[PDB]
């Protein structure tokens, strides 16, 4: 056991290691997402542009719980990046829906791993979780219900005019 | 023969005669689709600025051959810049269209002109196609489907306000 | 007949296209002129520079002709750009000697515009063709016989040091 | 088919893919090795600075891929990113040659990519390889060979004052 | 064996040491003119320092070829510089006229290095030589031409005016 | 014999000529010795700077002989450069010492060369030896004296530590 290590419970440790996994997996879906839009048949430079900001922002999530896992003492196990469930992303609608859908997954394990901190009387894991990722997955989440709802009321995903200007005149 | 001729083919001499003529003739398209947007029945400016800008740069494009001939030892020997197939591009996306299917038939030469130099074992041509000409087409190419992809979604070219949203937020 | 049509007569109209080639045509025989003087075999650089600044200049004396038709409500019709009588034009005073002769050509052909627009009584046509056109042709002439003369007095064609020269200390 | 497709064959297009797979391959195991150097138990910073770097480097690699495909009309497949053969690197120096055994390793693939290219007579891929690529593997092995070269004559792995060191005279 | 090395063959290592050697040989001839040009009997100072700087220019081709060879895990052997077949290089044309020579010798052994790159499939070194010497020699010869033209057509070698007017405007 | 030439003993311009060979040879050497450095099984970045440098600054020395040849009326002869007697420099250590061994030999010529000069009478060549060059060479084998004397209390050439601190700590 780490020199360092204190007060940091084994099924904790445990659990950082998969949200680190799962980061690195809507990390991934992201870059899905990204490259569909750069398609030549697709071709809406925005919602590209909006979906690789959001893959590098869950890498920058991803380094900060591998921070956590290092001075708290634990070691770090990494597991595959599983690829996303789809190749095709339909529409800009549809991968709004499909994004805000994830972020709803990965806050539901987050708070699983904050109730884990609580219990096993770790509040410095605690206050991490509340500090650096309660309120950025309200705020995400938010922010794709937001976009989620212009685009339904535009027309999208069958008005193609829709997702243009959207793509235009708020990711752009 | 030249003083600073050294491994140029008769063939690759005339080939390249050929595209100068071609990306002149590819200039000249350019800039008929470029005065037909500039008609006070279409007055689409970015349209036109768009390809106008095109032929401009093809003209970059047949100046870089003639130089390449000149530093071969070659010989240039110019023929008649022909007039387009259309004296009225008819709409935005149609011209989109005509203007990828021109630049598909241009780098088809492209590729044949480079495996004419692969053929007469001359690195320098065949380095000079790639370097200049190859990644060129592929970008411009992409371009043309990007645009193309767009116009379809909104509309066009039954909508005439789906050309005029076009002109004013990707080319403008 | 176009909505901004007014006091444009169909012989203007297809006198203008005629214009429109000449200068095309003009500008593709600058553009053989420069060409030829980067051969390795007469590699006279400010020659080159000298007639491809006036192939370029050309393009805008075809552009402004093509505005003119836009703005007035005629329709543009392209003609093939018609190759240079030569291929290759023996010396820089021979060069310097064809395009005198092929500015005073398009000379007479813009004084044969201009009487059209004065006999059809289109004083806006009239004032274009002076304003943009005959005293810019009374200038080219007469630097192109400023440049004749002093090769002729130097002795060229037959003197090479006097081409030399001349390349160095009028053209560069 | 890709209305911008044109000479990119099916067997290039899952190489690309393959190519994709593997830059993002070698970018999770940079990561690994990155945080390794973070433990508390080994504290080497510098180390962890080195490879940090070179997994952003790899995503690069691989975002460069991806625009490759896209622009030549292929369609990304994505497959899983498995995880490094090691959770523990033992050492500055072993790290060092278990990148560069993987970077030999890519470098290999990125051959017979080329290979492929050349056989599939597509001279824009087999360019795109040799000018991002190929020249980029051989800095690459060529400076791990000479970091590997350095600890052993410094005395690493067992003189811990080597590799203390060489991550502060080298890598800082 | 190099712990770098891959994909390079024993053939091409051999070959580029003979480059090397030709680099640096070119570098001595042009050291040779250059000097010619300072005797109190010739004292054409840019002739001088134009060769001077073609003796620098060749140094940095064979260090980029040694560069090449370190980076490949290939083995450097050098051979002695041999001295020019000429002390006393006549005139200013005379010395282009063996300049130009001399670069058409050395362009066709970095040709003859690119076939036996084509056929080791060594397409970095392929790619090595296309980017940084084939187009380097065509421009290289290019003006040397340029240069022996211009010389010529003045009235050198005869003409010592025309050697001294030379020295001032073309290469001043 | 040379309008310019006084004072200037065929004995003396043959001896200006034998020392312009010999500081090209040293130059050589150095050449040598930096791109041993750069091996990937050396990987001595500083030192293979440091005889880089010693490389250019012998090829500095050549010219200036060169000059004094050309301003006293001599007629340069040059003759082959030697490739040096190793392929192989073993270490660090090695090439100081064998650097110092070719500046004593270098300096011992000089030596000879200014006792020529006050033989024949030649205060001018006598002041340039010692201005230019006598020096010089104390400076250059003091230098060398002192990195060999530094590299043996730390233990080189079998400490590897030792050549690796040297390079960062003295050559760096
Ligand atoms: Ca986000
Ligand atoms: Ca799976
Ligand atoms: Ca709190
Ligand atoms: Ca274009
Ligand atoms: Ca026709
Ligand atoms: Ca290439
Ligand atoms: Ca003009
Ligand atoms: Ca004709
Ligand atoms: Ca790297
Ligand atoms: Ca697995
Ligand atoms: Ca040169
Ligand atoms: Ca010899
Ligand atoms: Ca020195
Ligand atoms: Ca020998
Ligand atoms: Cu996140
Ligand atoms: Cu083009
Ligand atoms: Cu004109
Ligand atoms: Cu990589
Ligand atoms: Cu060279
Ligand atoms: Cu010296």
Do not use: C
Request: aromatic share 8%; proline share 1%; no cysteine.
């Amino acid at each position: 056991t780490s020199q360092v290590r204190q007060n940091y419970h084994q099924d904790s440790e445990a659990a950082i290691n998969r949200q680190i996994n799962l980061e690195l997996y809507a990390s991934y879906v992201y870059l899905s997402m990204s490259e569909y839009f750069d398609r030549d048949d697709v071709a809406l430079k925005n919602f590209a542009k909006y979906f690789h900001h959001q893959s590098h922002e869950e890498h920058e999530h991803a380094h900060k719980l591998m921070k956590l896992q290092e001075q708290r003492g634990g070691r770090i196990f990494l597991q595959d990046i599983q690829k996303a469930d789809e190749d095709d992303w339909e529409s800009g609608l549809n991968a709004m829906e499909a994004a805000l859908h994830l972020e709803k997954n990965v806050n539901q394990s987050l708070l699983e791993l904050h109730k884990l901190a609580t219990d096993k009387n770790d509040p410095h894991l605690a206050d991490f979780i509340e500090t650096h990722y309660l309120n950025e997955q309200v705020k995400a989440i938010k922010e794709l219900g937001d976009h989620v709802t212009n685009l339904r009321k535009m027309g999208a995903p069958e008005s193609g005019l829709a997702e243009y200007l959207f793509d235009k005149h708020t990711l752009g």
